[PDB]
Design an enzyme around this catalytic site. Structure first.
Site, PDB file in Angstrom:
ATOM      1  N   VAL A  38      68.142  38.009  57.567  1.00 43.89           N
ATOM      2  CA  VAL A  38      67.419  39.438  57.722  1.00 43.89           C
ATOM      3  C   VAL A  38      68.302  39.698  58.522  1.00 43.89           C
ATOM      4  O   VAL A  38      68.750  40.536  58.315  1.00 43.89           O
ATOM      5  CB  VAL A  38      65.393  38.968  57.254  1.00 43.89           C
ATOM      6  N   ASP A  39      67.768  39.863  59.801  1.00 43.50           N
ATOM      7  CA  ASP A  39      68.066  40.843  60.889  1.00 43.50           C
ATOM      8  C   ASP A  39      67.101  40.473  61.831  1.00 43.50           C
ATOM      9  O   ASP A  39      65.373  40.258  61.110  1.00 43.50           O
ATOM     10  CB  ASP A  39      67.796  42.076  60.498  1.00 43.50           C
ATOM     11  N   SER A  40      66.592  40.662  62.750  1.00 43.74           N
ATOM     12  CA  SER A  40      65.695  40.149  63.943  1.00 43.74           C
ATOM     13  C   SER A  40      64.421  41.347  64.097  1.00 43.74           C
ATOM     14  O   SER A  40      63.488  41.643  63.979  1.00 43.74           O
ATOM     15  CB  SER A  40      66.371  40.628  65.509  1.00 43.74           C
TER      16      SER A  40
END
Length: 81
Positions: A38-40
């Site tokens: 995903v992403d952080s």
């Protein structure tokens, strides 16, 4: 309780939007910010949205221990309102 797959699908619908990862690839072995990737920062949006999506209260604080879709579901399935 809720339907596990519905829980996972609830995750999926948010992930497809925010992360940009297929609703359908949101399986149960899938580690959100790892296998799916995903992403952080986008992760926290999934969490915040999940609170409303599932009608529950999952804080980013503890959400960091979920790590997967299956374990996210574990929290939600048990923490169902």
């Amino acid at each position: 309780a809720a339907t596990q797959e519905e829980i996972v699908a609830g995750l999926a619908e948010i992930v497809n939007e925010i992360a940009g990862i297929p609703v359908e690839d949101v399986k149960l072995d899938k580690s959100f910010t790892d296998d799916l990737d995903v992403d952080s920062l986008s992760m926290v949006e999934v969490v915040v949205a999940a609170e409303e999506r599932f009608d529950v209260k999952i804080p980013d604080d503890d959400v960091k221990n979920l790590k997967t879709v299956g374990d996210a579901t574990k929290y939600i399935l048990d923490h169902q309102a």
